[PDB]
Ligand binder design. Structure first.
Ligand SMILES: O=c1[nH]cnc2c(-n3cc(CCN4CCC(c5cc(Cl)cc(Cl)c5)CC4)cn3)nccc12
Ligand SMILES: [Zn+2]
Ligand SMILES: [Zn+2]
Length: 342
């Protein structure tokens, strides 16, 4: 509780030596209290690049582009997806950069953020979201989203596969926590920034109660309605109801790490491409066992049995009998962080 008591978004600048071991570096950032914010930025060393150039991807297919329609007022909004037919990056970029969809003129982010919240319900943009794939060159061994090497790999017969996100101005991701309340890594390959809002995991339940109060219909219909990733809540609305939160802008060539039960939302500044996947550490096991799941959709559900038998052998019979009353401490870093804490 002494490390990062403010639970503010921390930024890391690892050397090539530090950066070479992904799982170890996550354990390090946690020993620094990075997890408490629910979100962290990792700026990689200058010499590291996951691909030589991105000039060969015009004919890359976006199977299911989604037009994002937003309904709402006074900081509370619902976002509805409309699947459009398959489009290429070339066609997406032309639309993203056109007069109708391009980024407005702004001097500072605060101005762009004001334009976003004022106009998110108008001129619905198209998000080239959830594209199965990677932009990493096969030889890249450091922080390869396709092959991280974390303990989530134990799931051996799509939380372990990379996804691509081609953004345009005003495209957004609603408040949510990862599936099974897992960790996530996001690399911004190129283009305009992506702004993020984060709620510290220790205050996550405060946000859920706020969301439950504002949408009582959706709350009854599904035990975890925020998992539908349709709910947009403005920073002003969070302020008005005392929800502690922080904000950060991710730029091209930067990573973002989301931590278990760390609620996040955000939006794209203009044409860009992010790559993302989920991941785990020993700390996540308890979060996965205690995760409240979407009950209205036949969703991403992992069996926790293999994880409990391997990393909590003594707890197996107790947990399986339904007697495991473990209370998660959100401030506590992952067991692997011990070498950085001594
Ligand atoms: O920029 C984003 N665009 C779209 N989605 C984002 C996101 N998440 C998307 C998912 C859904 C993953 N699922 C597999 C589909 C979970 N988090 N989390 C963070 C950022 C983004
Ligand atoms: Zn996410
Ligand atoms: Zn549901």
């Amino acid at each position: 509780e002494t490390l990062n008591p403010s639970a503010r978004i921390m930024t890391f600048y690892p050397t090539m030596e530090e950066f070479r071991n992904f799982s170890r570096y996550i354990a390090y950032i946690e020993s620094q209290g990075a997890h408490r914010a629910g979100l962290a930025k990792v700026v990689p060393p200058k010499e590291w690049k996951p691909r030589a150039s991105y000039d060969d991807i015009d004919d890359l297919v976006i199977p299911a582009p989604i037009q994002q329609l937003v309904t709402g007022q006074s900081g509370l909004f619902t976002q509805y997806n409309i699947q459009k037919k398959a489009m290429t990056v070339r066609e997406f970029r032309k639309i993203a950069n056109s007069d109708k969809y391009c980024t407005p003129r702004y001097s500072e982010f605060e101005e762009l953020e004001r334009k976003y919240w004022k106009n998110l319900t108008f001129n619905p943009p198209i998000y080239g979201a959830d594209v199965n794939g990677t932009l990493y060159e096969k030889h890249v061994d450091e922080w390869n989203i396709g092959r991280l090497r974390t303990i989530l790999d134990l799931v051996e017969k799509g939380v372990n596969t990379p996804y691509l996100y081609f953004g345009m101005w005003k495209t957004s991701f609603a408040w949510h926590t990862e599936d099974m309340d897992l960790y996530s890594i996001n690399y911004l390959h190129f283009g305009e920034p992506k702004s993020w809002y984060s709620v510290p995991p220790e205050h996550g339940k405060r946000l859920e109660r706020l969301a439950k109060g504002f949408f009582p219909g959706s709350a009854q219909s599904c035990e975890a309605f925020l998992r539908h990733k349709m709910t947009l809540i403005s920073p002003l609305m969070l302020k008005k109801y005392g929800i502690p939160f922080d904000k950060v802008t991710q730029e091209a060539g930067e990573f973002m790490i989301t931590f278990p039960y760390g609620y996040h939302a955000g939006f794209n500044h203009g044409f860009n491409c992010a790559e993302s996947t989920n991941f785990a550490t020993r700390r996540w096991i308890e979060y996965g066992k205690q995760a409240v799941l979407c009950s209205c959709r036949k969703m991403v559900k992992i069996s926790m049995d293999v994880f409990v038998r391997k990393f909590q052998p003594e707890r197996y019979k107790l947990w399986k009998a339904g007697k495991d009353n473990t209370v998660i401490d959100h401030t506590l870093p992952t067991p692997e962080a011990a070498e950085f804490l001594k």
